[PDB]
Design a protein around this ligand. Sequence first.
Ligand SMILES: OC[C@H]1O[C@H](O[C@H]2[C@H](O)[C@@H](O)[C@@H](O)O[C@@H]2CO)[C@H](O)[C@@H](O)[C@@H]1O
Length: 388
Amino acid sequence: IEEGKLVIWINGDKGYNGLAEVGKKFEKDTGIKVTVEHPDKLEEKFPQVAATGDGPDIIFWAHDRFGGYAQSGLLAEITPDKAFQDKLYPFTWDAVRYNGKLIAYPIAVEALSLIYNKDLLPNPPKTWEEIPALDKELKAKGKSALMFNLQEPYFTWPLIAADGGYAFKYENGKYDIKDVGVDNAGAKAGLTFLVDLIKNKHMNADTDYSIAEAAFNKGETAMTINGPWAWSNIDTSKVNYGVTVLPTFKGQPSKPFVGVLSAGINAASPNKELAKEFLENYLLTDEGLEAVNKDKPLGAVALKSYEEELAKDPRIAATMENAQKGEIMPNIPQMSAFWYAVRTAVINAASGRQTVDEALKDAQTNSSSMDVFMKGLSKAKEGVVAAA
Ligand SMILES: OC[C@H]1O[C@H](O[C@H]2[C@H](O)[C@@H](O)[C@@H](O)O[C@@H]2CO)[C@H](O)[C@@H](O)[C@@H]1O
């Protein structure tokens, strides 16, 4: 029963309940119902469902996915006037431009930070290199040094990029998809450090988002790596935590990929004007962002008037410090292939099924191949064998 309502998709780690509250206010004033959903793998489902009755009117995701959506014709060009554009930071609009056109509304700037338990660890490590020794000390006390999601390359990228890894070479506003940097010396060093941590029993190759979060919020591990959305669950656990700069590697800052959470409008929605009214007049206001932020923190928001309030938060300062040491994600269509390729490399290397060099060599080859994700799905289905 989605006909005649605004349907919104947003990731399940974000403040979907707070977003729903904004939706209730919109409905109160306009009579238009707003249904917020948080399907799994929504970023992969969108292209499969956008044209159907199950497609959302509005989709929230980091800006990196939107170029591929726009290439496929799945997103409407948005039409904010100059007065509205002036309300958000200019660099956030840049993140949602594709072939010269605005294709989403920027919401917040997300970057990973080091999150640490101040009771277990008053002075967090400045370097990745000191982490093995630190884990040894904590293991003796029945604790561990560090746990974070090893199944999503988003979380390992800061380390892979620290000493020189890169996705696609950038020059003069353009990315060269033939110049991939996931298999250079810097990338190799980072992933090798990670794999060594696993070989030496300082981390488990199977650690995922849930496992790491439970471990940190139960006080079992001294550190985790995560974004602003995770601060809320840590609050509930009453763990005394700090949010700080990521450790350095080979004396170089970890360099997270920075995402701008953005709201795109489905090109097939018959309610694009209403979606625009909701996004500009309800969500992107102090009251709207406050409701979402109160649910799960957004990070550094794109709306100047509300960032003015949040800027005093030292956790946001750390977020922006890590963000500025990192790099903005490209939004080119090839990003989906790059992410899948790197995800495969990290997982195969961590589990020991491939060496670092083999894994990253394959990642480089596959990073521009658009068929990689679909080919991945086929492998999971195994397939049959003929009698002849
Ligand atoms: O791991 C690859 C993945 O990274 C980014 O996804 C982030 C997302 O930006 C965050 O908002 C949060 O939800 O965590 C995700 C990682 O689990 C890219 O945006 C995404 O396209 C990419 O697949």
